[PDB]
Please model this.
Amino acid sequence: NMSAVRETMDVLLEISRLLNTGLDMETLSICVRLCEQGINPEALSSVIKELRRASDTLK
Amino acid sequence: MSAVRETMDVLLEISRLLNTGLDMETLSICVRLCEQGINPEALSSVIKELRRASDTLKA
Amino acid sequence: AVRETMDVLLEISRLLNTGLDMETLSICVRLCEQGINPEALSSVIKELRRASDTLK
Amino acid sequence: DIVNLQVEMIKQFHIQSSEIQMLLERYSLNESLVSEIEKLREENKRLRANF
Amino acid sequence: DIVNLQVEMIKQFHIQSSEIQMLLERYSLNESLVSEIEKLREENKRLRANF
Amino acid sequence: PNVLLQNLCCRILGKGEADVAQQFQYAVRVIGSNFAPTVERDEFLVTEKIKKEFVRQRREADGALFSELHRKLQSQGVLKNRWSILYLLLSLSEDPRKQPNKTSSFAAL
Amino acid sequence: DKFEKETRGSLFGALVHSRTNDMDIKLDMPPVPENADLSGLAIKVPQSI
Model:
């Protein structure tokens, strides 16, 4: 089971990297868990962009 | 009473095919409001918020 | 100038089957000459006509 | 479509501002309530005459 | 999309009023205190109906 | 109309006979706003959009069927509000496709 | 006994305020009313007893 989830992650992780992402592996894991738990794809995409932007203004 | 019932029955035929997914009783109310003048766009919007509100509540 | 124009505009409205009053068009010339965006001018009046309908 | 956004937005602000003020004018004190506080002070003075 | 936009505009304003409405009830006046002025009044009338 | 919209709220939620007051208050607000619908009256124009929608979910047999139902509908009663009902249904259509997510955990966020 | 008790409450008419059988009451008039600061003092007429 442990092996299977790793491979599921592993493939998605490869795709995220090709497309270029700023998310790490930990965050990416969280997103999937949200996907499974419902949550239309546009709301998730938006909350991310606003949070990414606010972090740059702060730092 | 005869005339009214016969449009509704024809009206319920369309609703089940077109995939409205509303109930019989509720549709009669939608039609009475139209004949008294309502905007269609507003009316669908209200239906939608009420619909989503019911599903979440039950679970 | 305002009146002369109002009569020609009154002719046009009648063709479109759109009711506007004599008065509305004359006020419109006053607003234009002060500067009004075309969208704005139309929007205030469109709503004002619907308000009149509901009201009575 | 943009016309709709332009008319409607203004309407929502006007309605919403009407409600809030109407809530504020009622809650800040009705005259009726104040008068009982005045009565209670008059009552308190007569009570202090019984002692 | 424009219709989805409208559902969000109107619904947000409705939320705002509910939040504002309660906050305004609590700190603009105490219902608790006013009930207590009326009570004291009543206690004092009853005191005077016992002489 | 107050009664009709309140009964509308109670019926859809399947319960709440004075607990749907909040939802009601919203509905009274939305309806009290105004719209300008793209396509206003005229029976031909709405029937044409409904047929395209039928083809798109791959329900051809239904598109052909509906058209007879439309002529029938007319014959049974004639309104000036006919179009508003047909446009109302149109907007309120549902797609068969996809799951409509969970609501059994989507409630919580 | 009715006549004696009635007199006694008012202390031979030396009270107008409250009835007491205590002999420990302080004889004092009240502070000026709040309705007597908006218009000045006004004598109460004992109407409708």
